[PDB]
Design a binder for this molecule. Structure first.
Ligand code: HEM
Length: 154
């Protein structure tokens, strides 16, 4: 799949708003993920003991992880589809070291869309959400293709 330039503009226009608060959006997204799909929190050894949302909000490790996730995703989106080199190391560690199924990448995609929609309604109407969903489906499809070359799931 290939996004048109107008779809990329819609994705990078709401992303520039996310980048005004990367740690705050990082937290929101990871907590939304962990609440919605609590099975995903077990993949995180450093903070799978967390029991409540208040403990998640106060964790400095969880916030730092959110910043890591969003900074890497932001570097991939800004490539506008030319992201082959950025995906390689990412696919390798999620498929071989952490073992994250594609399914979980779908779950965090859903968490991203949920939080942008709540925080940025004005910049995240139907067309901007359709373009963000297309940009995350492209990311997932490319990463699933790399998992397959690496010897993992699909
Ligand atoms: C937008 C999708 C995602 C991006 C861009 C992303 C990015 C990263 C990055 C940059 C790192 C640090 C370097 C590395 O280990 O490769 C990381 C580590 C990790 N990621 Fe992801 N990730 C994503 C989704 C997930 C999901 C959905 C899970 C699990 C449910 C997951 C679990 C982990 C784990 C366990 C680590 C290790 C954390 C620690 O250091 O102990 N990732 N991820």
């Amino acid at each position: 799949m290939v996004l048109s330039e107008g779809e990329w503009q819609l994705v990078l226009h709401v992303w520039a708003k996310v980048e005004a608060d990367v740690a705050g959006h990082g937290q929101d997204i990871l907590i939304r993920l962990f609440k919605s799909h609590p099975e995903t929190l077990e993949k995180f050894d450093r903070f799978k003991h967390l029991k409540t949302e208040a403990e998640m909000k106060a964790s400095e490790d969880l916030k730092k992880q959110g910043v890591t996730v969003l900074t890497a995703l932001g570097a991939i989106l800004k490539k506008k589809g030319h992201h082959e080199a950025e995906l390689k190391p990412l696919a390798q560690s999620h498929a071989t070291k952490h073992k994250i199924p594609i399914k979980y990448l779908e779950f965090i995609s859903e968490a991203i869309i949920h939080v942008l929609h709540s925080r940025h309604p004005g910049n995240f109407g139907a067309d901007a959400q359709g373009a963000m969903n297309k940009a995350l489906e492209l990311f997932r499809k490319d990463i699933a293709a790399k998992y397959k070359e690496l010897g993992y799931q699909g």
